[PDB]
């Protein structure tokens, strides 16, 4: 309704550039000032600057200063930061968010795209089954191993399935590839009676897959 | 042409009048230099080359074994069987450059390909009667007063992904280095200066090409894990004096860009690597001692096991000094023409 | 330059939890961020509070000195909580609930035919809604332990229930898993009287 | 006495695998078994007969030693390798029909002057062509006492043969596998201490209040500063700095040596190279008869005469064998 709807999750090469876009839908593009908010994994928030839409102007923090570009494209609504000569710490959740006043009260935020510098490369998940033959409550699940780079989603029954749902945290293996868990409980009573499905994406390699979990 | 094994001479332009040890150790042992030698071009041509399996590196070996026989002989020389001693003449000791050369029948090829890493195939090639003038300098650590690399730092190993196996990097820039011992005080302290911005800049430039060979993680550089001194320490001779220097401050994530001061004790007990087995040599000349060297190159050991903070961590190592040919040595093998 | 304590707080259900944060004013706006989301916003202008949020939320200040506070907490409030000036943003106060004892559950999971056939073996062992976050798990095959062979990760702190999740992974070549017939996995908590066990063979 | 060329006889095996004996039976002849001594001024300085078993042990080498490189001014040379067992034998050069070889039976000949007990012979003794420096290996020794040989011995310049009363055993290993360069000596100390001293005594005869000190090489090729050799088919190049010393050990004695694959050339000028030592252990167990020394010129510091060590001229080897003996129309 009144939303910003970011790109996604980007892997790019050090000293390479990234581009987020940002697009707002529900409010005049043109009547508040755009920022950026980056926030590297497990850290707080850092301002990266503004820009106007009636003016395309800018305003960078000088951290960023000559390595962020801030423009926009007031036809389709669209906001785009680049930033260029990327490095490691630059590995962070890049945020677009209106500022409603000049309270700098950010009420509007984009729900964020995650950007890895690094230098190689991307691979598609592997994903297996976590059967369940134990007993009045069973446990199922998918591993979804040896992808790069973060993020891949998890959702069962292609979204149906929610409660009892666990999906973990990736944890890096000693491969430097990620690989997670999703899990759920079920009414053991089910095992015999219902499809489970879970569906794994990861846009990074443009890998998706539908997984059966078989008894 | 066609890869084959055999004896090469040397060459070397010692002075028959001259008192220091490598350069009587070559008046007998090598011919003097070709002053306008013949290097024969190919055009495009293609050849194999193993940097890690080349009967050259061996024979340097032995020579460099036959120079320290001569020139360093120790009072006493600790082998488990045995305990020995001997005479210990101090003696005059500067490495004069050596070539290796081809006889009759034979030729060295040389890899001209600006960046080869030592094993595989090369696209520049070119015939030669000699290779170039190799000074048989002993150290750990740092790789002095060698050669640099043309283009840009070539990272050489027989197996990467194999932790164990040492890593022999080639310097786009030399950077200096100055150890001295001044004159009388504690006679065995001594120092070495180097130029923390340029030897900082140095290590950003291995470090980043080493990202590239592991591009999953960090490449952190931190101080040597353990075991011989010498090889914990850039240990080395200057003036038949056996320096150990240490190298936390080189090999640090945090480098300071101002001058930086390396700690170094001449010592008399030593591990040889000629063999197993401890020596002990006299106590130092007087006076000021002085090395300054060209650092041409690194040896490094990776790490095993998982890496705790997606880090891989390397650490200054050698005690092979095999290695330290083959980083001179890589781009040339004997082939007999036909 | 933006100051917050306390960086981390516990708190019961219902209790009054107050942060505060130290910066000339004004303005001065607090946002609340969970695992995973985009920050939403609280307060504006120190102590005015934003359309559609809880009223058990509020925000004071005098001066440079500011107070954010929670009246009743309730379980969905696990979050960090960010004062902000402008570009600057406070270092944030994670806010964590304190409940009573859960054990947990217990499931154990061989590893796939599919994942076989390439050649790994992944033994999976999941604790499952379980209070505190403390918890331990050591793996055994055969009655051997193990070390260094596996990995685990914990869920975030479950906003309607409070609790904890955790999976330890084992990891080890098709050969080493099929040099060995049962496989197990023993979860000591707090919970549980005597610690749990649970296995399966090859 | 006449310019002509001798014939060389010897008792070489046509079946044998060693070197000597394969170049002896196609350039040498048969032992005689009935040889015949007939009893009826020398020079060993001047004598053609050294000239000639220079050239034979050049021959024999050539053959059985072949290095991997020879390297002379000009030139580089490569050839096969092959290592070889090898033994010197004895040869017997003898004269051709019309000539016959005078034998000097002398009790003390110094080699330079006139010799009084002379027998005719038609072959030399059997004479082994071992090559080496300072130390003279598996010879003939002195009958009656040690002797002093030399064109002139006011002539510093000139070396000076010593022919031993007693022969002193020497054993030079390099054992099985390390540094398999690496060798070592075993000579008894009380036997060469007293060694010195007779040959210290009788020098002191020729250099009457002087005392008479031994001292390590001067300088030179490594062939001369050090006792250099072939045992089966390796060069060996040993340390004698414990050897010629003022102050010898009573004790054992332990020589470092060096197996060497480059050497300088004693047939001509130039450096060959040789293959690596074979596997195994490695050992010469030969009898030291005679000596190569040098004495110090100049005016005597201490009122002591130096000697030291010498060599490289193997033609001086042979002198030492071949003194008794002219030829003769
Ligand atoms: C990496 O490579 C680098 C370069 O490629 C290496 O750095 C090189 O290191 C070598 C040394 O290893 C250097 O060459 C050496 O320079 C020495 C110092 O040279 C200066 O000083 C001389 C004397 O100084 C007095 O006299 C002059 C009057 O002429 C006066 O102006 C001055 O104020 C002072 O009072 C001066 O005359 C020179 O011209 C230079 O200015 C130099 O002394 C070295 O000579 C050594 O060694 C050579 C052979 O290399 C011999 O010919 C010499 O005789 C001298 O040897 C002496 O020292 C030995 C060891 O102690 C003795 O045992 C010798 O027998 C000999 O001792 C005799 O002489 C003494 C008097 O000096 C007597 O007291 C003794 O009893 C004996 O008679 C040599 O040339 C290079 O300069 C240097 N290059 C660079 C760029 O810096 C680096 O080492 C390498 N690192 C590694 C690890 O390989
Ligand atoms: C001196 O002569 C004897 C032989 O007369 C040599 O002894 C030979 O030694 C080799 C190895 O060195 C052995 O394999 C042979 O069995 C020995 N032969 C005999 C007949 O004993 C000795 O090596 C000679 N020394 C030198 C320096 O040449
Ligand atoms: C060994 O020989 C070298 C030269 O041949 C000489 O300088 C050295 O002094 C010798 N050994 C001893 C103990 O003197
Ligand atoms: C040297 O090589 C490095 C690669 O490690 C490169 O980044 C640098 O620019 C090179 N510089 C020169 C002058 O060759
Ligand atoms: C110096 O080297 C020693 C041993 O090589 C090492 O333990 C030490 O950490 C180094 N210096 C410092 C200041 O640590
Ligand atoms: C080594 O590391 C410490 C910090 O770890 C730093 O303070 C010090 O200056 C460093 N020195 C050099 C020479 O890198
Ligand atoms: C200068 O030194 C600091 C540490 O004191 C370091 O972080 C920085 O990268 C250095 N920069 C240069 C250009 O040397
Ligand atoms: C050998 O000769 C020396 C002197 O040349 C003499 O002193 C010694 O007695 C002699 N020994 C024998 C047994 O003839
Ligand atoms: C040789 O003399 C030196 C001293 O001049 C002495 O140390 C050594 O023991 C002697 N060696 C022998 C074998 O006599």
């Known amino acids: 309704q009144v939303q910003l709807v970011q790109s996604g999750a980007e892997v790019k090469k050090p000293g390479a550039s990234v581009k987020v876009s940002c697009k707002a839908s529900?409010?005049?593009?043109?009547?508040?000032?755009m920022h950026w908010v980056r926030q590297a994994p497990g850290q707080g928030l850092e301002w990266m600057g503004w820009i106007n839409p009636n003016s395309g102007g800018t305003n960078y923090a000088q951290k960023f200063q000559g390595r962020v570009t801030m423009t926009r494209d007031t036809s389709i609504s669209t906001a785009y930061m680049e930033l260029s000569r990327l490095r490691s710490d630059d590995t962070a959740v890049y945020y677009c968010?209106?500022?409603?006043?000049?309270?700098?009260?950010?009420?509007?935020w984009g729900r964020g795209t995650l950007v890895t510098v690094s230098s190689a490369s991307t691979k598609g998940p592997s994903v297996f089954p976590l059967a369940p033959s134990s007993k009045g409550t069973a446990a199922l699940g998918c591993l979804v191993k040896d992808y790069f780079p973060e993020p891949v989603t998890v959702s069962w029954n292609s979204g149906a399935l929610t409660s009892g749902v666990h999906t973990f945290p990736a944890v890096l293996q000693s491969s430097g590839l990620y690989s997670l868990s999703s899990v759920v409980t079920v009414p053991s009573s089910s095992l015999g009676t219902q499809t489970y499905i879970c569906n794994v994406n990861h846009k990074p390699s443009n890998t998706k897959v539908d997984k059966r979990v078989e008894p | 042409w066609k890869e084959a094994k055999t004896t090469l001479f040397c060459a070397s332009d010692a002075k028959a009048y001259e008192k220091e040890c490598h350069n009587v150790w070559a008046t007998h042992a090598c011919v003097p230099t070709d002053p306008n030698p013949q290097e024969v071009v190919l055009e495009n041509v293609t050849e194999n080359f193993n940097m890690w399996k080349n009967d050259m590196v061996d024979q340097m070996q032995e020579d460099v074994i036959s120079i320290w026989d001569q020139c360093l002989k120790p009072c006493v020389k600790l082998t488990g069987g045995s305990t020995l001693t001997q005479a210990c003449p101090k003696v005059t000791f500067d490495p004069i450059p050596i070539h290796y050369c081809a006889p009759a029948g034979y030729a060295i090829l040389k890899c001209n390909q600006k960046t080869f890493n030592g094993k595989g195939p090369c696209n520049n090639v070119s015939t030669v009667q000699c290779t170039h003038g190799i000074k048989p300098v002993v150290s750990t650590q740092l790789l002095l007063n060698g050669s640099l690399a043309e283009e840009e730092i070539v990272i050489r190993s027989k197996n990467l992904r194999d932790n164990a196996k040492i890593i022999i990097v080639q310097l786009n820039k030399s950077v200096e280095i100055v150890c001295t011992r001044p004159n009388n005080g504690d006679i065995r302290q001594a120092y070495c200066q180097i130029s923390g911005r340029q030897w900082s800049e140095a290590v950003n430039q291995v470090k980043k090409k080493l990202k590239e060979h592991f591009p999953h993680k960090q490449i952190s550089f931190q101080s040597s894990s353990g075991g011989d001194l010498e090889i914990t320490t850039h240990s080395f001779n200057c003036g038949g004096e056996f320096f150990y220097c240490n190298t936390s401050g080189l090999f640090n994530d945090t480098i300071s860009n101002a001058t930086i001061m390396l700690p170094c004790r001449i010592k008399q007990i030593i591990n040889m690597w000629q063999e197993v087995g401890k020596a002990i040599y006299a106590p130092p000349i007087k006076g000021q001692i002085t090395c300054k060297s060209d650092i041409t190159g690194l040896l490094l050991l990776r790490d095993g096991g998982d890496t705790t903070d997606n880090t891989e961590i390397f650490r200054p190592s050698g005690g092979d000094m095999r290695d330290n040919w083959r980083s001179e040595l890589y781009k040339y093998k004997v082939v007999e023409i036909k | 330059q933006m100051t917050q304590s306390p960086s981390s707080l516990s708190a019961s259900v219902g209790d009054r939890v107050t942060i505060t944060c130290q910066a000339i004013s004004n303005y001065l706006n607090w946002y609340q961020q969970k695992p995973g989301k985009a920050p939403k916003l609280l307060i504006y202008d120190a102590s005015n509070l934003e359309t559609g949020v809880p009223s058990r939320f509020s925000g004071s200040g005098s001066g440079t000195d500011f107070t954010f506070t929670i009246s009743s907490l309730q379980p969905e409030d696990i979050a960090t909580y960010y004062c902000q000036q402008y570009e600057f943003i406070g270092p944030g106060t994670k806010v964590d609930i304190k409940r009573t004892v859960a054990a947990p559950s217990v499931f154990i999971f061989p590893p796939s035919d599919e994942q076989l056939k390439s050649g790994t073996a992944s033994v999976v062992c999941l604790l499952n809604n379980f209070y505190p976050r403390e918890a331990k798990v050591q793996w055994k095959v055969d009655n051997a332990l193990q070390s260094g062979n596996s990995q685990e990760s914990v869920t975030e702190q479950d906003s309607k229930d409070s609790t904890y999740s955790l999976s330890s992974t084992l990891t080890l070549s098709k050969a080493d898993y099929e040099k060995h017939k049962v496989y197990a996995c023993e979860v000591t908590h707090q919970g549980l009287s005597s610690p749990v066990t649970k296995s399966f063979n090859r | 006495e006449a310019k002509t060329t001798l014939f060389c006889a010897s008792d070489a095996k046509a079946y044998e695998k060693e070197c000597h004996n394969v170049w002896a039976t196609h350039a040498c002849v048969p032992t005689d078994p009935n040889p015949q001594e007939v009893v009826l001024n020398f020079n060993m300085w001047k004598n053609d007969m050294v000239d000639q078993m220079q050239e034979d042990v050049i021959s024999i080498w050539d053959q059985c030693l072949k290095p991997c490189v020879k390297l002379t001014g000009g030139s580089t040379l490569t050839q096969a390798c092959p290592k070889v067992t090898f033994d010197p034998i004895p040869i017997h050069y003898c004269a051709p029909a019309g000539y016959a070889i005078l034998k000097c039976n002398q009790k003390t000949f110094n080699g330079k002057g006139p010799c009084n007990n002379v027998s005719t012979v038609q072959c030399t003794h059997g004479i082994k062509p071992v090559v080496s420096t300072q130390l003279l290996l598996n010879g003939s020794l002195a009958e009656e006492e040690i002797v002093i040989r030399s064109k002139n011995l006011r002539d510093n310049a000139k070396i000076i043969i010593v022919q031993l009363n007693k022969s002193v055993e020497i054993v030079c290993t390099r054992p099985n596998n390390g540094d398999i360069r690496q060798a070592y000596c075993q000579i008894s100390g009380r036997q060469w201490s007293e060694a010195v001293n007779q040959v210290k005594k009788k020098l002191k005869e020729h250099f009457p209040h002087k005392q008479i000190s031994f001292q390590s090489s001067s300088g030179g090729d490594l062939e001369i500063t050090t006792h250099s050799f072939n045992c089966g088919g390796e060069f060996f190049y040993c340390n004698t700095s414990g050897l010629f010393n003022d102050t010898i050990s009573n004790a054992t004695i332990m020589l470092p040596c060096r197996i060497k694959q480059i050497i300088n050339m004693w047939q001509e000028v130039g450096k060959a190279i040789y293959a690596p030592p074979i596997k195994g252990q490695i050992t010469c167990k030969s009898d030291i008869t005679g000596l190569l020394l040098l004495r110090d010129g100049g005016d005597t510091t201490d009122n002591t005469e130096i000697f030291r060590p010498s060599g490289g001229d193997m033609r001086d080897n042979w002198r030492s064998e071949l003194y008794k003996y002219k030829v003769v129309e």
């Open positions: 529900g409010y005049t593009f043109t009547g508040y000032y």
């Open positions: 968010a209106r500022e409603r006043s000049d309270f700098w009260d950010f009420d509007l």
